[PDB]
Amino acid sequence: VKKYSAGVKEYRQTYWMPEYTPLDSDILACFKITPQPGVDREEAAAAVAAESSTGTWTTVWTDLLTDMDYYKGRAYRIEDVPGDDAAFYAFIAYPIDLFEEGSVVNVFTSLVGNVFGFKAVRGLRLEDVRFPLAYVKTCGGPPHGIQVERDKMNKYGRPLLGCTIKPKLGLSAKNYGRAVYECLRGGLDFTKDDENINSQPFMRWRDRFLFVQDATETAEAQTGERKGHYLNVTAPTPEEMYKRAEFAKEIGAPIIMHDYITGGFTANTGLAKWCQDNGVLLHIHRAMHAVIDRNPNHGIHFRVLTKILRLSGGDHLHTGTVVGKLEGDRASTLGWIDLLRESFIPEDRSRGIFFDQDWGSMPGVFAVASGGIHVWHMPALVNIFGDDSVLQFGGGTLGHPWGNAAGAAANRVALEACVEARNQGRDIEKEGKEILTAAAQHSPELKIAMETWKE
Amino acid sequence: MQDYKQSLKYETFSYLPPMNAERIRAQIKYAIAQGWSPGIEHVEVKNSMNQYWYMWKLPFFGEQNVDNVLAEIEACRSAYPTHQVKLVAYDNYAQSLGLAFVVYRGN
């Protein structure tokens, strides 16, 4: 358009470009639109493209001051949703110039800011986002990544083992350290603060960090293996968050943890840069993901949140446990684990991967499994996740009949037996019981652990 | 309740029973199958937590014979009978170790 004509106009006239070929620099988004009957697909797609980028509900003269053809987001492909005729996939291209470089915040705000509120759609689901390599290079990414972390902690050949201290709340700092000490001395690589553990009247953070570090060092001396505890630095303000991170560095804590959604992307990105500058590993908890990621018709798929975390920065990311998930959602889970860890993920619709995602040199992130998992889950966990994973057994350790040290040893024996059997070429999931039963003959801890919880 | 006995550990597989020759062989074979280059490191027991152990010769880049690797392990052990000895597998695509585990515990 070259002349200014005021009034309301249809989004399709400008934001639906079926013949557009996305550039390599473009950010691409796949939205699953469940529109209200009566609204046209192209118009729904164009409306999402316009409102997420440069469009307005009515024509504004200021558009003529700039070149909307260059800047505008454009819907370029419509596809059916397999097996769901109420919904369709809209593919929208966004010029890279629309986004602040190195800002997952800005890109996220633009894509999810207000399109989710449209009365035209019954539901809007952001399925996938193609971050071009040019954008990826502007982002800090994981402060260390899988390989650097293994070198720093001198851990090779197996998944790492972790435990969340339980109960989630209520323990004093000294008792918290006692629980940490017992878990670590028994064979866990890591222990962690619960996501809810920040600084509470029952346990102030500085007291917690001191006792935990004492526990970590004592266990490390007594086992001859490196140990860590993810100290939660999630805090009310950035100043408080950095203060806690600095104290962890000062006392020699190798790893800290943060809640990137609840704490927020701005805080997380700053923390990730701080972690890289100070050599501290960063474990990321995904609290609130289920609020946003569960509903298949409305929200954001976790795979998108996974990509944002890798760009924002974390050395570990909580990924849930595939054991609970059904086979339909298993392939999707394997999909985002590849996104978390691999360098190049090719497009694969069966796994929910709508775009080729190139990470280039950006390091991979440890996948973290947790939940109500215990020794019996070990074979399936080792199979699904592989070596570059952290398996966290909170209840499965502190709930052992003989205490944390025995529970840790039971999990450690189960893990090592599964790994040894895998390396020998056995099908660990098929032979899981036999493997665990054989290992239990040499470990009373594993034996009673297998009796405590059911297969 | 049983009391958990604290002892020093040696990272991956150290919580399992000590490996016989067959188990060790399977791990090396797996590493070669992955395309990783086996290597041997050794260090004085007290320095086990150092980032840089002594490297025995060079990584066995392109080694396909597990027996050669096992012979090198014995040769390192003979040269340094009190040292812990660790098998590593270099992954040049990730520039990380694909696996690492202590074969001899030292002293």
Binding site: I146, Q147, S343, D356, S361 | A94, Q95
Partner: peptide
């Protein structure tokens, strides 16, 4: 990992 499956490869 990392460089094994790059876009170039």
């Amino acid at each position: 990992p990392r460089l094994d499956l790059i876009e170039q490869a």
